[PDB]
Structures are given as C-alpha cells and as structure tokens.
A paper describes a structure:
In contrast to the case for phosphorylated CFTR, addition of ATP to the dephosphorylated channel caused only a small shift in FRET efficiency, from ≈0.25 to 0.28 ± 0.01. To explore the molecular basis of this shift, we determined the cryo-EM structure of the dephosphorylated wild-type CFTR in the presence of 3 mM ATP to 4.3 Å resolution. Consistent with the smFRET data, the overall CFTR architecture was largely indistinguishable from that of the ATP-free CFTR structure. These data indicate that ATP binding to the dephosphorylated CFTR does not induce any global conformational change. The small shift in FRET efficiency is probably due to local changes that affect either the position and/or dynamics of the sites of labelling. Dephosphorylated CFTR adopts an NBD-separated, auto-inhibited conformation.
The cystic fibrosis transmembrane conductance regulator (CFTR) is an anion channel that regulates salt and fluid homeostasis across epithelial membranes. CFTR belongs to the ATP-binding cassette transporter family of proteins, but uniquely functions as an ion channel. It consists of two transmembrane domains that form an ion permeation pathway, two cytosolic NBDs that bind and hydrolyse ATP, and a cytosolic regulatory (R) domain that includes several phosphorylation sites.
Author numbering: 5 to 217, 222 to 409, 435 to 635, 751 to 769, 844 to 883, 911 to 1172, 1207 to 1435
Write the structure that this text describes.
Amino acid sequence: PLEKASVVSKLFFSWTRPILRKGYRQRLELSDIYQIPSVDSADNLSEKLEREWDRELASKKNPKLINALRRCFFWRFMFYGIFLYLGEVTKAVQPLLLGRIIASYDPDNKEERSIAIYLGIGLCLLFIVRTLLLHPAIFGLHHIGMQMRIAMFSLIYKKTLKLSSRVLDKISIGQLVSLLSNNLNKFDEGLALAHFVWIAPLQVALLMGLIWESAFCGLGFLIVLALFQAGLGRMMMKYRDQRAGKISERLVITSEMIENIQSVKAYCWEEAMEKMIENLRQTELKLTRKAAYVRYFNSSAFFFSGFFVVFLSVLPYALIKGIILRKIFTTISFCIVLRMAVTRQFPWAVQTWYDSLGAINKIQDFLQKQEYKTLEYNLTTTEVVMENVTAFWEEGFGELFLLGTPVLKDINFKIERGQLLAVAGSTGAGKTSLLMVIMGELEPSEGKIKHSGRISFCSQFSWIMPGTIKENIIFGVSYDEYRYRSVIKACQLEEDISKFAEKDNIVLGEGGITLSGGQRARISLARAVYKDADLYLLDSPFGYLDVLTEKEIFESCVCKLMANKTRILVTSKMEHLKKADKILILHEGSSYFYGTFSELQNXXXXXXXXXXXXXXXXXXXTTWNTYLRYITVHKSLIFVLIWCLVIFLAEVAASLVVLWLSSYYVFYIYVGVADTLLAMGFFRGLPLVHTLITVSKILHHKMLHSVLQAPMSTLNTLKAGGILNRFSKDIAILDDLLPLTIFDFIQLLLIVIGAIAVVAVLQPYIFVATVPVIVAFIMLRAYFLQTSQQLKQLESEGRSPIFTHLVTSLKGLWTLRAFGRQPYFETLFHKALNLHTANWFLYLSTLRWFQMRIEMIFVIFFIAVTFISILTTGEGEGRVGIILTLAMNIMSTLQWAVNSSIDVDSLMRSVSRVFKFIDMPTEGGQMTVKDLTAKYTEGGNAILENISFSISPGQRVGLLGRTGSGKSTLLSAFLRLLNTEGEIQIDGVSWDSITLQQWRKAFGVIPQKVFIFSGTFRKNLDPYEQWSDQEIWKVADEVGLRSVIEQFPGKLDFVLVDGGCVLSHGHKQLMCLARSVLSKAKILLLDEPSAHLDPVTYQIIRRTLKQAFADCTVILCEHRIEAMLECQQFLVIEENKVRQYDSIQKLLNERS
Ligand SMILES: Nc1ncnc2c1ncn2[C@@H]1O[C@H](COP(=O)(O)OP(=O)(O)OP(=O)(O)O)[C@@H](O)[C@H]1O
Ligand SMILES: Nc1ncnc2c1ncn2[C@@H]1O[C@H](COP(=O)(O)OP(=O)(O)OP(=O)(O)O)[C@@H](O)[C@H]1O
Ligand SMILES: [Mg+2]
Ligand SMILES: [Mg+2]
C-alpha cells in the first residue's frame, strides 16, 4: 500500500508501529513491506537527474556532475542542515541554564527554589526541543541520500548499457562491481554526517565566544589531540596495508584446500596442513595485535582527554586564588560539548565529504566514456554492400591510419535480397569483427555502407535472459503460434522441450544454467529465426552441437524457412560453402577470396555478492548460549573480565568515599567527568584486547580442526564456495572488528553503569527512579531487535538481484544492442531497485523511530532526576552540581552505548555460524567386498548397491565404463571417502575392526584431478617431515624426476605459485605417483591416467608402476583398447552392477 500520515505522526514516526508489531509477532515477508511513495520512484529520480545532467553537459564548458547536482538537490540539503545547526545550538547553549541553577542553589544568593525550578523546566523543554529538531532532520538527510543513490545507480546503469563497443574489452568488471558495491552504504548513511563541515566551526566559535576570554589552552590541547588522532590513523593504515598482503597468501592455501578434500583425506595430510595454517596465522597474529593495540591507544586517549582538556583550561585561571564550583561545573559542561564537536564530528565530516566527492568524481569519470553511435539504415535497395572498409579497434590508430594493425582491409561485395553468404577463417581471423562492422558496433574509418536495418544476431557466446522459453524466443512481440511452431519444428528443439514436466512456460535462471550448451545454442538459433528481419547474422551457430545434429539442422531450417531471405553464416564446411551463394575467406585480418567454387575449383561469475544470500540465510539469530560459549572459551579472558569489573567497582567505591568525605577545588573535575573517571587505562584494558585476540585464534584453530577431518557426506552437503566464505569473511570480522566492538561496548556500558550508581548513591531516590528507566531501555531494545535484524537480513538477501541483472545485461550486451530491448531492461532494473529501496527505506525509518524513542525515554529520566534532586533539600554545595553535570552529560555516551550494544549482536551473528561449524560432527593385499553401498549424501542416488566381488593377490584389475557411470564413486567407496555399509576384508580385516587412519595409509591412489598446493617440492613430497634427502633422491631416481628437478631454476625448492600450473598433466601424475611410492602401500589404486596424456609419459608411467609395484594388486581405470592388455582380470560398471571376467576377448563376444 501507500503510506500516509499527519504532521504529528510524521514527526514522531508513529506509522512504523504496524510493521514493528507484525515483525515482533511473526516473521517478516516481502509482501508486508508497503510501496514506496512516488517521490522515490526510480524512473522519477532518473528523469529528474537526467533533465539537469544533459543541460549541464550542453551548457557548461567544463563538465562537472556537482554543477547539476547542486541545482537538483542542494536546497533540501540546506533546509535540513539549518535545522540540524539550530538543534545543535541548543546543546551548545544549555549549560548556561545549568550554571544559573547551580548559582540559584548555592548559598551566595537568597533566591528561593522557585526560580531554580522555573529554570529546570526550561532546561527540560530545551532537551525536548533539541530532540524534536535533531532527529527528523537526520531522517530527512538520509532520505536525500536515498534519492542520491537511486538516481546515481539508474544513470550509471543507463550509461553502462549505452556503452561503446570499443571500451567493452577494456576489462574492468571488478572495477564496475566495486563501484556498485562499496558505495551503497557509504554514500547513503554518510550524507547526514556530511553536513558537519561548517557546523563544527560554528559550534566552536559559539563555544569560545560564550566562554569568558585563558580558555584558549583547551583549543591548543584539542588541536594537538586532534592531530594526534590523525597521527595514529596513519599508523593504522600502515599495519593494515602490510597485513593485507599476507592474508591473501594464506587464504589461497585454504581455497586450494577445499577443492581437494578427497586427496587430503586419502593422503592423511590433516596434521601437516593444520600446522602450516597455524604457522601462517601465527605470523599474521603479531600484525593484528599491533593494529588492535594502536586502536586501543587511540580510544583510550580519546576517553582520557576529558580530564586534561579541562585541567589545562582551568589551571591558567586557577593561579588567581579562587574558583567557585559553579564556574568549574559550567566549564566542564561546555568543554564536553567542545570536545565532542572538535575531536570527532569535524574529522568525521571532513573524511565523509572527501569520500563522497571522490566517489562522485569517479562516477563522473566512468560516465564520460565514449558513447555508442548507431547509424540510420534508410539507404534504399535493401542490399548488403560495402567498399574500401578500414577498421581500427583503438581510437589512437583509428584517427591516424599503417601505424596500427587493422582487422579488415579492402573488402567489397554486393548481394541481392534472398542470397545467403558464408565466411570462413581461422580463430581470430575477423569474422566476428566483420559481423560487428556490419551491425555498426565497430565504426569504419574508411568506407560507406548502405544496407537494410532489420538485423538478427546469434552470438558465438550463448546468452539467455532470466525468463522463459517463449519469452526468450519472442522477446515480447505478439505471440505468433504458427511461427513459433514452425521454428521449434525446424530447429528440432521440440524433443528437448517436451521432456520436461513444464511444456510451454519453462522458467530458467540466469545464464541458462538449467540447460546445457547445445540447448542454449538451439534456443539462440530459434530466437534468431523468430526475430522478424531481412538480414540474419550468425556467429558459430553450432559450436556446441554434435556432428549429426549440425548436419541435419542446416537442411532442416536454414535453407527451408528463410531460403528466400538474405543471411550471413559463419561456417568452415564444404557442404555449407557449396550451398552458399557467394563466399568470403579471412586470413590474418585480411580477405582471402571472393567468388564461387566455379572459380575456386577451376574474475568470478557466481560472486560473493550472489553467494551471500545462501550464506547469511542460516544465521537464525542471538541466543545467550553463543555468548556464554564465546566468553568461557579461554580462562584468561574470564580472569581479565573479572579483574576489570573489580577495578571498576574499586574506583566507584573510592569516588564514593571521597564524596562522602587548596587543590580540592580542582579535584572535583575527575569525579565530575565520568568519561575520565571510569575509562579503562592502558594497564586494565590491553589484556582484554589480548584475550580477545587469543580467543579469535583459538576459535579459528578449532574451526580448521573441525572443517578438516570431517565426514565427507556432511562436508559435501554444503558447497565449497559457502565453506570458503566463512574463512574469507567471518574469521576476519571475528578477529579485527569484533574485539574493538566488544571493548567499546564494555567501556560504554561501564561508564554509564558507574555514573548511574554514583548518582543513585548521592541521592537514593534516583536509585528507584532508575529501575523503570533501565527496564524500559531493555524492553525497547528487545522489541526493536526482532524487527531490525529481520529487515536487515531481508535487505541483504535483496542485494544480489541487482548484480545478477547487471552481469546478465553485460554478458549479452551485443544482443541487447542489436534487438533494442533497452526500455525493457531499464524497467526491470528499476523494478528490482524499487524493492531494494523499499527495504532500505523501512530499515532507516525503524532505526530513526528506535533512536527517537530511546532519546525520549532518556529525557523522561532526566526530568525525573533533575526535578527530584533540585526539590530535595540536600546538604552541601558539590552534590547538586555534580549530580546535575553527571546526569546531563550522559546522553552522548548513552547513544554510543546502545549503538555498540546493537552492533555487537550484529557482529556475533557470525560467531554463531562459526560455532555451528565447530559443532559439525567428526569421524599381496587381496580384497573381498560384501554388499557395498554408498552415496554422495544421505538420501542420494545409490550408484553402487549390493556389490560383491573379489581380487586375487599379485594380480591386476581393469575397470571400464562410461563417464559419470560411478567409477570415481567406487574408488571413493574403496577409500572410505563416502558413507558405506557392509565390509571389505584385506586378508580378513574390514573398516569396522581397524582404524580408518591406518586404513587410508594402506591404500594409494591418484585422483582424476591432481592436487598441488603453493609450496616447495620438498613440502609437496614430504609434508610430515618424515623423509630425508637421500631417500627423496632415491624415490626421484626410481620414478625419474631428475629432469623435473633440474629443469626449474630452484633445485628441489621451486615454489609452485598459482596452483603449480608449471607442470604438465603427465608431470603432475608423476609427482603424485612418486608421492604414493613415498607413502609405501602394499596396494595401488588408479583413475584415468590418459585423460590428456602423451605416449612417452604414458609408457614411462607404465614402466615405473611395473618396476615398483610388480607384486601388488592394481585397480586400473582406463578406456583405451591398447591399455587393457596388462589387466589380467576385468571389471565393468553398468548401471549399478558389476561383472568380473577372466579375459577381454570374451567380453567382445557380448558387445562386439
Ligand atoms: N571489441 C573489441 N576490441 C578490441 N579487440 C577486439 C574486440 N573484439 C574482438 N577483438 C579482437 O580482434 C580480433 C578479431 O577477431 P574476431 O573475433 O573478429 O575473429 P573470429 O575469427 O570470428 O574469432 P573467433 O576465434 O572468436 O571465432 C581478435 O584478435 C579479437 O580478440
Ligand atoms: N559433488 C557431487 N555432489 C553431488 N553429486 C555428485 C557429485 N559429484 C558427482 N555427482 C554425481 O555423480 C555423477 C558422476 O559420478 P562419478 O564422477 O563419481 O562417476 P564416474 O563414472 O567415475 O565419472 P567420470 O568418468 O565422468 O569422472 C554426476 O553426474 C552426479 O550425478
Ligand atoms: Mg569469431
Ligand atoms: Mg569419474
């Protein structure tokens, strides 16, 4: 529906209560989120931004995006900014009322308490006004940021779809995804904070024009302190930059680890790799600890500023022999606000302004790319003809001309309507370039073209949009049943479409993942045929088709349906060329022949942004069980927390005794500033950070030990990308951000609790006033979290549609440019962006409501405490002032405390998953199988079921079968890689009676895909450090690795960087065979040695196996006829059955 509300409801955010109620009661769905108002429609934002951007481009000599952006959206920005400034002015000014109240209570004046209470009610009204004029302005600024982001995304999508063809191969997909990823939160949330660029200077000017002029020492200290904070900021980036290189090196080791869990389990390498990963983590831990230490010093310096910033301000005026407590209390209340405005607000505003300007400049720079210029095709006679065509891909050579290499030179031809052509050439000859220049994507430097306009495209690359078969074929045109039936019958895709349960509206995903290459190609041909045009362009139409189907499809459709319509074909076959009318051949970017035979014969696709939807969906947030598990894992962490609590309580007790009981007048500062009174020093908080780092290291080590040495069925139940995502993101969050968030939350809760306790001790009525306030805080936070977490999760799940649409549009850019479905793609992109905008808008609205209500509750607490304290007829001069100051300066710390309280739960939502993966479960030589059965996962397809066979010692077994029949599954079942029931006895012992560890070592196998890691040859041969140089040399000599060792510059220590691709397939097979010879096993297992092998390495492998394992049993797997001469026994897998034969010549009797 459409939201609508009155002025009071708009100001107090009372219209978000229905969705809070629904989310609290039950799980939120995509249906309950109401429709965005028309103000924030993607189409409206795009139109409004373009109407100014095009005018700016047409008028301004120097183009800058901010020039149009200001005349677009600056007015409301300033309108919200003035409200923000007037709200902050009240916070700046309110301590004057505090000082006057203190003067009223002090025995200097005889004025009754009536004036004091008349001022206190005004102070509370001032807080109410400041809240009411602060929070809605922040929400409005967030709204402005929303419109900003939506308009920017729409315009940049329009540009990236209108891109020129030349810059497409300047591959910057990573740059584009980074641009659309890193900006969404930064340019949206930061706009509200961006307005403090002049608010802080105006506030400090007001503060120091309202303090008696002396007081400049406070500015001198803050200026040094502000520069000091930036001084440690550079150190942070110095350590982070250094460590970022090492985490990349360690991560790729884990990435290569998941892809070969089978090989790792077979080789029993869990301990060595565990030690290697532990060593790498130990190396990175020092840098992480240094970064955490400097962050702690920065935070502690900020917290300890509070005392010195007033101390160094009062001492210049303390030499004048007298300070009234009213003056010191009011200068404390002024200096806290001054510090808040100087040390944090101004640097944050400057940094966010710089980041926003950089992002806008980068977006403009990308947008200023050269456009795609289409050409009218109204030139008559509707025939394809060119003359003197010169083509240059790069603009520099295109505008100069033979300085650069061309791709088409001096090509001429002319074909009447109905005649079909054929182009043949080598790979990269330029057939695709000729197609592009015919289309108009490539601009010809020389040569005028006159031909028809209606064109059709079937690209080399298969592209399918996320729709259905009918939509993929017709592209929204009127559904012609006769044409559709004719095209499906001609393309012979009916036999494929009718196999599915769905017949007419089969829905596909992105990129046609459901189908295969042949189906995608035939769908592309069907689309090309269906597209009504007088010039059909094809680019390798049958690249993924078989020979028979490719031969049949030509005479079925091409010269039967559009035989009277002109088309251009890409082919290299004599029959197609013979049927073709005129012929063109391209060589080295130049045409080779023109005429007839009458003359001739006479870096990731499924990115983490897309995997996050399936990764974060299992959070199910969190419970206190994970809190307890995370807090009790390490003893020293508990001891340090206990020590911190004891120190806090001791400091509170000392302050209490001091208040119960010369420089005394300058001693009240320490107690009067809870920020410096209860902040943890460098001797009581550094062990906390150290313990957090140790907890992170222990959790990572246990997670590695759990993911490794785990049942393969359960491990394969999850995907490799998903299991790697944890080590990529969750460990980094738990190690870097989590300790800092934990420390900040602990400190901000400790200061607030100490302030409340001491205030209650000075006045016991405030103790009973606080309990309802605390329970209200807790209840309201619990109420808000349930809806907030669900809304954030839904928004995160809704992020990936935008990027999937982006990649889908990019993959088929040429097809979209040829077909003119730009409006359809724009409206679909806007449809997705509207849902994402609605999610983010509701999240922002509920966050603003939460902040409003917590501030209102604190205001109620403040009025209660202040009125009760001022009305009570207390004794002493300090008590009233100190209580008022403490209860007045808390709110700034309380906001950060509650923000950290929500953020710590948001972060620990990840240690929840980490603990779940901690909690995942864990587990001659003759053979005789007894009813073997296994499957990839429980409930899967039992490839092997009720299997019984035996192998004689000192023999060989040859295994033959089609691909995918289950040979790999049988080898895994032998290896105990998968869950199995039954037994196989090696001379009498099965899996059950002996340890699986020694079971694995008794075997030996090379995988279908060999495994190698980024390590030296010595480490890849002997990861366990159980071998010596002489025996390694002996193994290398026996297997024949001397040439392999000497061929590389590093003698036996050449590092295998980037997956060890230096070795060939045969070299890798020799490597793993030598490794198996090292791991001495009485039995050997084999799996397809000749997938991409050459005869010399094949025969050397045969020689090595014959010489090394002549007296064992080898289960060889190969389909070659010549290979099967050395297999005394035979075995075949034919659809879940096994037949063992004494010879192969009798097998040929069955299947000659
Ligand atoms: N947009 C482009 N910008 C720059 N170079 C390009 C672009 N498109 C293609 N090329 C390159 O120009 C050359 C022309 O090759 P083209 O693909 O046109 O020939 P082909 O024989 O049809 O190719 P294929 O081997 O893909 O069947 C190739 O080296 C190709 O990589
Ligand atoms: N990781 C996996 N998860 C789920 N199913 C799988 C997995 N790997 C393979 N399969 C299933 O097993 C089939 C292939 O079985 P497998 O590779 O073990 O037999 P094969 O005859 O040795 O294969 P090939 O000779 O093609 O390597 C696949 O088509 C699929 O149905
Ligand atoms: Mg090509
Ligand atoms: Mg296989």
